[PDB]
């Protein structure tokens, strides 16, 4: 009170240029404050938005970990458990974020907003009302100031003068209410700057404490155990990778001579003593064929189970000459079957006979 | 290794429907994993974005508090100090947020991203390469399977058969690399699920500890002190508000009779014994006029200082009759001046004479 800035409400009636000046300095100031406070309100609003999103996202991450188990994954309990622990602990965190989110809205956002939506709105409003009142009183005064000294009807002089009464009353009242609001803003200014910051910090103290109590040394050990498991999977993954690369390298060499339909007669002997034989054939479409308990089964690379094709070894088999296709054959006790090579063509007939 | 799911790389050359089936179950699975992991990656990315924004916003809020002092506010150290403390403490917090923000990107975002950008990309790529290889080998095989048994030129049979060699080699190799990658994904799957969560929690442990160390009981007291100051301003603000409302209510009553230009002659006596007089007049424009050390000063409601108008009390003053305007007068040792009423017109002439 003692040193605070104040507009002289008792000089309202006079409405002297000086007084109007002083009023001007408060508006210039009230505009600056408005500029600054709006920048602070924007920054705090972002903090409130980031915290709200952070909470939501952290909650979703946790809900996602609980759904892991409830998946239709075509292709294990320990994993399930571990995700349950992470889920749990991540929940406790989103809550901390939720709580802080709620408090921030009520101790920080609400006050700073009220300052902006109500108090700063009030200043602008009362400034216009007063401005209109001031204007109306200018007109009334110029009309009164123009009354004829010679003639002028009484009903006129009377009304014109009354207009000066009502206009000057209205101007005097709106100016005092406007001054009162500006004087008050000097208090709200301080309050609106501190209350929010105060609310923010209290919520933070509360947030860091609630969070720290769930992060015990027990969790640190659980994270240590899991840390070790993952490092183990990493080792194993690499151990298996070498093995696989080695198998591959070894298979390309071993299989190279086996890629041509017609192998070296001298190095890859026709097998005539087989009781089981499988492989693709063409049937006048291409399908995979295989032997099993006296039956020649078939399965299109598309099928999911396959089926029966013909009976075996109690049937007759002979190389057939269908169309102009090499290596065909037909059995009976079947469509025309076409092998891929002499060797292949022979192995079938011979195995089926066996 | 012992119970892990595995695609049979040794059955690659055979390429049997069954083997193709099994491959199918891994792809169905690899698609599911991809669905789920992408949902988890999105959730973690939001958490990383919210934390980054939170840090930025909290830093801006702090920078704004340091700029408060450096304002041109037309209209105090304690306030300055208090904002310096809030600023400081809010900084320490944004840093905690920054640090956590950096760590999250390196321990959580980087791994989960690599899984998605590299490993899952690798699966799709190797699946297409193999698919093209498989297709090319189908064509080569149908063309070889169609070679004439009767005629057929040797240069042809030769080339066609070679195509079966290269195509089958390519198919066999791309299938093994594809199987190897799918088998590996079974390890990365576990790793990619845990590593991120593990990184997240470690950063959080670190974040809550760093933050808690700046929120000491000293701060709690500083917030208590400030809490008390603001509550004091609130009291004072209300104390002043009553006073002002009271002044207003009292001024409307006291000023009501004073609003009409021509007051009751009987209740508001013309003051002829004045050595100082101020008020608005019209000069053949409306300006505010006032007495000071023997001079009649003027100041347009727009001016910021005003000036000289005429000398006084060593001059002659008489009611003038300019145009058809009531209450005009002119002095000399000035433009025609017009008062607002008999009373007003008289007080001027008389004060100027005095």
Tab-separated table of C-alpha atoms in Angstrom, chain A residues 1 4-6 9-10 13-18 20-21 25-26 28-29 32-33 35-36 39-40 43-44 46-47 50-51 53-54 56-58 60-61 64-68 71-76 79 82-83 86 89-90 93 96-97 134 137-138 141-142 144-151 157 161-162 164-165 168-169 171-173 176-177 179-180 183-184 186-191 193-195 197-198 200-202 204-205 207-209 211-212 215 219-220 223 226-227 230 233-234 236-237 239-241 243-244 247-248 251-252 255-256 258-262 278 280 282 286 288 290 299-301 303-304 320-321 324-327 338 340-341, chain B residues 1 4-6 9-10 13-18 20-21 25-26 28-29 32-33 35-36 39-40 43-44 46-47 50-51 53-54 56-58 60-61 64-68 71-76 79 82-83 86 89-90 93 96-97 134 137-138 141-142 144-151 157 161-162 164-165 168-169 171-173 176-177 179-180 183-184 186-191 193-195 197-198 200-202 204-205 207-209 211-212 215 219-220 223 226-227 230 233-234 236-237 239-241 243-244 247-248 251-252 255-256 258-262 278 280 282 286 288 290 299-301 303-304 320-321 324-327 338 340-341:
chain	number	residue	atom	x	y	z
A	1	UNK	CA	0.000	0.000	0.000
A	4	UNK	CA	2.315	1.114	-4.606
A	5	UNK	CA	1.365	2.917	-7.821
A	6	UNK	CA	-2.112	4.452	-7.798
A	9	UNK	CA	-9.667	8.475	-8.182
A	10	UNK	CA	-10.366	11.832	-6.488
A	13	UNK	CA	-14.351	14.669	-11.842
A	14	UNK	CA	-11.767	17.269	-12.889
A	15	UNK	CA	-10.579	15.064	-15.788
A	16	UNK	CA	-7.497	17.234	-16.327
A	17	UNK	CA	-4.973	16.464	-19.134
A	18	UNK	CA	-2.377	15.633	-16.464
A	20	UNK	CA	-5.377	11.794	-18.431
A	21	UNK	CA	-1.585	11.550	-18.862
A	25	UNK	CA	1.181	5.611	-18.252
A	26	UNK	CA	-0.874	2.898	-16.568
A	28	UNK	CA	1.101	1.586	-21.513
A	29	UNK	CA	2.140	-0.466	-18.500
A	32	UNK	CA	3.362	-4.432	-21.415
A	33	UNK	CA	2.270	-6.660	-18.529
A	35	UNK	CA	2.415	-8.862	-23.494
A	36	UNK	CA	4.728	-10.526	-21.007
A	39	UNK	CA	4.175	-15.151	-23.173
A	40	UNK	CA	4.475	-16.798	-19.755
A	43	UNK	CA	5.045	-21.374	-21.980
A	44	UNK	CA	3.144	-22.780	-18.993
A	46	UNK	CA	2.981	-25.973	-23.308
A	47	UNK	CA	4.364	-27.479	-20.102
A	50	UNK	CA	3.612	-31.893	-22.720
A	51	UNK	CA	2.926	-33.340	-19.268
A	53	UNK	CA	0.782	-36.178	-23.436
A	54	UNK	CA	3.665	-37.677	-21.481
A	56	UNK	CA	-1.010	-40.603	-21.825
A	57	UNK	CA	1.906	-42.014	-23.813
A	58	UNK	CA	3.457	-43.599	-20.742
A	60	UNK	CA	-0.286	-46.568	-23.462
A	61	UNK	CA	3.229	-48.016	-23.442
A	64	UNK	CA	0.753	-52.388	-24.702
A	65	UNK	CA	3.007	-54.527	-22.513
A	66	UNK	CA	-0.020	-56.171	-20.833
A	67	UNK	CA	-1.469	-57.074	-24.234
A	68	UNK	CA	1.720	-58.795	-25.366
A	71	UNK	CA	-1.448	-62.166	-28.846
A	72	UNK	CA	-2.089	-64.766	-31.549
A	73	UNK	CA	1.642	-65.020	-32.185
A	74	UNK	CA	2.016	-68.188	-34.325
A	75	UNK	CA	5.367	-68.912	-32.684
A	76	UNK	CA	7.147	-68.857	-22.683
A	79	UNK	CA	9.144	-63.366	-20.877
A	82	UNK	CA	9.245	-59.843	-17.090
A	83	UNK	CA	6.754	-57.839	-19.157
A	86	UNK	CA	7.820	-53.643	-16.567
A	89	UNK	CA	6.385	-50.312	-12.788
A	90	UNK	CA	5.563	-48.264	-15.883
A	93	UNK	CA	5.064	-43.916	-13.353
A	96	UNK	CA	2.900	-40.019	-11.067
A	97	UNK	CA	2.636	-38.202	-14.386
A	134	UNK	CA	-15.966	10.190	-22.643
A	137	UNK	CA	-19.783	13.725	-23.097
A	138	UNK	CA	-17.770	15.487	-25.782
A	141	UNK	CA	-20.595	19.465	-24.357
A	142	UNK	CA	-20.103	20.767	-27.869
A	144	UNK	CA	-24.333	22.821	-25.064
A	145	UNK	CA	-21.366	25.019	-25.849
A	146	UNK	CA	-23.183	25.962	-29.070
A	147	UNK	CA	-26.478	27.089	-27.560
A	148	UNK	CA	-27.655	30.445	-28.938
A	149	UNK	CA	-27.394	33.446	-26.614
A	150	UNK	CA	-30.005	35.443	-28.512
A	151	UNK	CA	-32.909	33.114	-29.221
A	157	UNK	CA	-31.653	24.643	-23.672
A	161	UNK	CA	-28.081	20.850	-20.549
A	162	UNK	CA	-29.555	17.615	-19.128
A	164	UNK	CA	-24.461	17.309	-20.197
A	165	UNK	CA	-25.628	16.079	-16.781
A	168	UNK	CA	-20.823	13.837	-17.313
A	169	UNK	CA	-22.231	11.524	-14.649
A	171	UNK	CA	-18.152	9.631	-17.723
A	172	UNK	CA	-17.317	10.266	-14.070
A	173	UNK	CA	-18.531	6.841	-12.951
A	176	UNK	CA	-13.657	5.767	-11.449
A	177	UNK	CA	-14.470	2.101	-12.049
A	179	UNK	CA	-9.253	3.632	-12.306
A	180	UNK	CA	-10.254	1.202	-9.564
A	183	UNK	CA	-5.252	0.144	-9.313
A	184	UNK	CA	-6.312	-3.407	-8.485
A	186	UNK	CA	-1.215	-3.679	-9.519
A	187	UNK	CA	-1.980	-6.314	-6.854
A	188	UNK	CA	-3.169	-9.130	-9.112
A	189	UNK	CA	0.001	-8.558	-11.139
A	190	UNK	CA	2.184	-9.795	-8.271
A	191	UNK	CA	-0.275	-12.516	-7.283
A	193	UNK	CA	3.088	-14.042	-11.335
A	194	UNK	CA	3.833	-15.968	-8.131
A	195	UNK	CA	0.787	-18.106	-7.462
A	197	UNK	CA	5.123	-20.653	-10.118
A	198	UNK	CA	4.317	-21.592	-6.527
A	200	UNK	CA	4.178	-25.555	-10.252
A	201	UNK	CA	7.027	-26.165	-7.755
A	202	UNK	CA	4.777	-27.710	-5.107
A	204	UNK	CA	6.991	-30.966	-8.713
A	205	UNK	CA	8.109	-31.607	-5.119
A	207	UNK	CA	5.884	-35.611	-8.198
A	208	UNK	CA	9.557	-36.339	-7.523
A	209	UNK	CA	8.784	-37.823	-4.100
A	211	UNK	CA	8.145	-41.294	-8.117
A	212	UNK	CA	11.233	-41.913	-6.026
A	215	UNK	CA	12.203	-46.810	-7.631
A	219	UNK	CA	14.010	-52.621	-9.014
A	220	UNK	CA	17.665	-51.905	-9.673
A	223	UNK	CA	16.844	-54.469	-14.010
A	226	UNK	CA	17.059	-58.696	-16.952
A	227	UNK	CA	20.131	-56.861	-18.157
A	230	UNK	CA	19.378	-59.986	-22.589
A	233	UNK	CA	20.462	-63.904	-25.598
A	234	UNK	CA	22.844	-61.641	-27.439
A	236	UNK	CA	23.575	-67.096	-27.966
A	237	UNK	CA	22.240	-65.212	-31.014
A	239	UNK	CA	26.818	-68.259	-31.475
A	240	UNK	CA	23.927	-69.491	-33.637
A	241	UNK	CA	24.710	-67.006	-36.404
A	243	UNK	CA	26.891	-71.912	-36.982
A	244	UNK	CA	24.302	-70.944	-39.615
A	247	UNK	CA	26.118	-74.483	-42.542
A	248	UNK	CA	25.255	-72.243	-45.499
A	251	UNK	CA	25.787	-76.417	-48.255
A	252	UNK	CA	26.499	-74.249	-51.294
A	255	UNK	CA	24.911	-78.790	-53.377
A	256	UNK	CA	26.547	-77.169	-56.405
A	258	UNK	CA	23.335	-81.216	-57.435
A	259	UNK	CA	21.686	-78.238	-59.171
A	260	UNK	CA	21.581	-79.564	-62.750
A	261	UNK	CA	18.771	-82.013	-63.538
A	262	UNK	CA	21.247	-84.408	-65.208
A	278	UNK	CA	10.262	-87.904	-52.812
A	280	UNK	CA	8.574	-82.876	-57.763
A	282	UNK	CA	4.834	-82.899	-63.643
A	286	UNK	CA	3.670	-79.453	-61.086
A	288	UNK	CA	5.458	-82.605	-54.977
A	290	UNK	CA	6.309	-88.734	-51.964
A	299	UNK	CA	0.942	-82.129	-52.516
A	300	UNK	CA	0.793	-78.953	-54.576
A	301	UNK	CA	3.251	-76.372	-53.272
A	303	UNK	CA	-1.827	-77.229	-50.584
A	304	UNK	CA	-1.642	-77.486	-46.802
A	320	UNK	CA	5.486	-93.943	-70.877
A	321	UNK	CA	5.785	-91.705	-73.905
A	324	UNK	CA	6.693	-85.094	-76.905
A	325	UNK	CA	7.900	-84.813	-73.288
A	326	UNK	CA	11.091	-86.529	-72.162
A	327	UNK	CA	11.189	-88.741	-69.078
A	338	UNK	CA	7.250	-86.608	-65.908
A	340	UNK	CA	13.450	-84.348	-64.657
A	341	UNK	CA	16.261	-86.553	-65.910
B	1	UNK	CA	18.953	-72.539	-28.424
B	4	UNK	CA	13.895	-72.017	-29.823
B	5	UNK	CA	11.896	-72.062	-33.062
B	6	UNK	CA	13.960	-72.754	-36.177
B	9	UNK	CA	18.002	-74.682	-43.482
B	10	UNK	CA	19.029	-78.235	-44.458
B	13	UNK	CA	17.353	-77.696	-51.494
B	14	UNK	CA	14.360	-80.052	-51.342
B	15	UNK	CA	11.922	-77.102	-51.180
B	16	UNK	CA	9.037	-79.389	-50.208
B	17	UNK	CA	5.485	-78.006	-49.652
B	18	UNK	CA	5.797	-78.909	-45.958
B	20	UNK	CA	7.164	-74.096	-47.563
B	21	UNK	CA	4.347	-74.433	-45.000
B	25	UNK	CA	4.068	-69.977	-40.166
B	26	UNK	CA	7.180	-67.895	-39.537
B	28	UNK	CA	2.581	-65.017	-40.336
B	29	UNK	CA	4.424	-64.685	-37.041
B	32	UNK	CA	2.293	-60.176	-36.115
B	33	UNK	CA	5.517	-59.220	-34.334
B	35	UNK	CA	2.311	-55.192	-36.070
B	36	UNK	CA	2.845	-55.226	-32.326
B	39	UNK	CA	2.572	-50.109	-31.966
B	40	UNK	CA	5.124	-50.163	-29.142
B	43	UNK	CA	4.043	-45.282	-28.037
B	44	UNK	CA	7.726	-44.938	-27.123
B	46	UNK	CA	5.382	-40.250	-28.295
B	47	UNK	CA	7.024	-40.549	-24.879
B	50	UNK	CA	6.524	-35.388	-25.003
B	51	UNK	CA	9.726	-35.441	-22.948
B	53	UNK	CA	8.754	-30.745	-25.599
B	54	UNK	CA	8.493	-30.810	-21.816
B	56	UNK	CA	11.969	-27.168	-24.095
B	57	UNK	CA	8.860	-25.643	-22.529
B	58	UNK	CA	10.309	-25.847	-19.036
B	60	UNK	CA	11.473	-21.340	-21.961
B	61	UNK	CA	9.397	-20.750	-18.831
B	64	UNK	CA	11.017	-15.868	-19.442
B	65	UNK	CA	11.472	-15.344	-15.704
B	66	UNK	CA	15.029	-14.016	-16.223
B	67	UNK	CA	13.759	-11.491	-18.772
B	68	UNK	CA	11.136	-10.108	-16.403
B	71	UNK	CA	11.449	-5.034	-19.172
B	72	UNK	CA	10.461	-1.463	-20.035
B	73	UNK	CA	7.540	-1.692	-17.625
B	74	UNK	CA	6.378	1.946	-17.209
B	75	UNK	CA	5.427	1.239	-13.598
B	76	UNK	CA	11.338	-3.403	-6.765
B	79	UNK	CA	10.212	-9.413	-6.665
B	82	UNK	CA	12.158	-14.156	-5.973
B	83	UNK	CA	11.977	-14.568	-9.753
B	86	UNK	CA	12.289	-19.585	-9.329
B	89	UNK	CA	15.301	-23.857	-9.654
B	90	UNK	CA	13.254	-24.193	-12.839
B	93	UNK	CA	14.549	-29.017	-13.627
B	96	UNK	CA	16.881	-33.014	-15.546
B	97	UNK	CA	14.342	-33.159	-18.360
B	134	UNK	CA	11.619	-68.834	-56.778
B	137	UNK	CA	13.185	-71.026	-61.252
B	138	UNK	CA	9.572	-71.835	-62.067
B	141	UNK	CA	11.721	-75.410	-64.972
B	142	UNK	CA	8.635	-75.165	-67.137
B	144	UNK	CA	13.088	-77.351	-69.455
B	145	UNK	CA	10.101	-79.537	-68.713
B	146	UNK	CA	8.849	-78.651	-72.209
B	147	UNK	CA	11.929	-79.649	-74.190
B	148	UNK	CA	11.090	-81.803	-77.224
B	149	UNK	CA	11.987	-85.494	-77.014
B	150	UNK	CA	12.008	-85.947	-80.783
B	151	UNK	CA	13.915	-83.024	-82.258
B	157	UNK	CA	18.663	-78.133	-74.665
B	161	UNK	CA	19.215	-76.799	-68.764
B	162	UNK	CA	21.848	-74.256	-67.646
B	164	UNK	CA	17.710	-74.520	-64.485
B	165	UNK	CA	21.169	-74.657	-62.885
B	168	UNK	CA	17.983	-73.381	-58.808
B	169	UNK	CA	21.280	-72.194	-57.339
B	171	UNK	CA	16.706	-70.006	-55.348
B	172	UNK	CA	18.622	-72.280	-52.981
B	173	UNK	CA	20.902	-69.492	-51.765
B	176	UNK	CA	18.892	-70.125	-46.999
B	177	UNK	CA	19.725	-66.471	-46.356
B	179	UNK	CA	15.725	-68.729	-43.434
B	180	UNK	CA	18.825	-67.550	-41.583
B	183	UNK	CA	15.835	-67.691	-37.430
B	184	UNK	CA	17.829	-64.698	-36.215
B	186	UNK	CA	13.707	-65.007	-33.047
B	187	UNK	CA	16.633	-63.660	-30.983
B	188	UNK	CA	16.373	-59.980	-31.896
B	189	UNK	CA	12.680	-60.241	-31.013
B	190	UNK	CA	13.490	-60.788	-27.330
B	191	UNK	CA	16.380	-58.325	-27.374
B	193	UNK	CA	11.522	-55.907	-26.595
B	194	UNK	CA	13.676	-55.709	-23.456
B	195	UNK	CA	16.621	-53.511	-24.343
B	197	UNK	CA	12.299	-50.973	-21.658
B	198	UNK	CA	15.583	-51.512	-19.826
B	200	UNK	CA	13.792	-46.397	-20.324
B	201	UNK	CA	13.767	-47.472	-16.640
B	202	UNK	CA	17.471	-46.794	-16.106
B	204	UNK	CA	14.041	-42.812	-15.161
B	205	UNK	CA	15.971	-43.989	-12.085
B	207	UNK	CA	16.056	-38.709	-13.689
B	208	UNK	CA	14.200	-39.065	-10.387
B	209	UNK	CA	17.448	-39.057	-8.394
B	211	UNK	CA	15.691	-34.156	-9.621
B	212	UNK	CA	15.217	-35.097	-5.989
B	215	UNK	CA	14.370	-30.273	-4.116
B	219	UNK	CA	13.294	-24.898	-1.133
B	220	UNK	CA	10.220	-25.960	0.798
B	223	UNK	CA	8.182	-21.692	-1.122
B	226	UNK	CA	6.762	-16.746	-0.818
B	227	UNK	CA	3.475	-18.453	-0.082
B	230	UNK	CA	1.433	-13.661	-1.768
B	233	UNK	CA	-0.681	-9.129	-1.014
B	234	UNK	CA	-4.038	-10.810	-1.308
B	236	UNK	CA	-3.848	-5.905	1.236
B	237	UNK	CA	-5.483	-6.017	-2.218
B	239	UNK	CA	-8.309	-4.015	2.079
B	240	UNK	CA	-7.660	-1.446	-0.665
B	241	UNK	CA	-10.640	-2.621	-2.710
B	243	UNK	CA	-11.572	1.540	0.605
B	244	UNK	CA	-11.889	2.305	-3.122
B	247	UNK	CA	-14.511	6.325	-1.961
B	248	UNK	CA	-16.470	5.767	-5.180
B	251	UNK	CA	-17.982	10.526	-4.568
B	252	UNK	CA	-21.048	9.762	-6.680
B	255	UNK	CA	-20.578	14.970	-7.047
B	256	UNK	CA	-24.153	14.505	-8.262
B	258	UNK	CA	-21.935	19.145	-9.407
B	259	UNK	CA	-22.637	17.568	-12.816
B	260	UNK	CA	-24.858	20.281	-14.328
B	261	UNK	CA	-23.048	23.327	-15.729
B	262	UNK	CA	-25.443	25.674	-13.882
B	278	UNK	CA	-8.525	25.632	-13.294
B	280	UNK	CA	-11.889	23.616	-19.398
B	282	UNK	CA	-13.549	26.860	-25.339
B	286	UNK	CA	-11.611	22.952	-26.202
B	288	UNK	CA	-7.855	22.799	-20.176
B	290	UNK	CA	-5.093	26.772	-15.283
B	299	UNK	CA	-3.148	22.208	-22.219
B	300	UNK	CA	-5.131	20.304	-24.825
B	301	UNK	CA	-6.361	16.991	-23.442
B	303	UNK	CA	-0.856	17.592	-25.192
B	304	UNK	CA	1.763	16.177	-22.838
B	320	UNK	CA	-16.998	39.572	-24.226
B	321	UNK	CA	-19.791	38.821	-26.655
B	324	UNK	CA	-23.823	34.073	-30.494
B	325	UNK	CA	-22.115	32.054	-27.732
B	326	UNK	CA	-23.133	32.474	-24.101
B	327	UNK	CA	-20.573	33.101	-21.368
B	338	UNK	CA	-16.072	30.633	-23.308
B	340	UNK	CA	-19.803	26.900	-19.153
B	341	UNK	CA	-22.163	28.836	-16.914
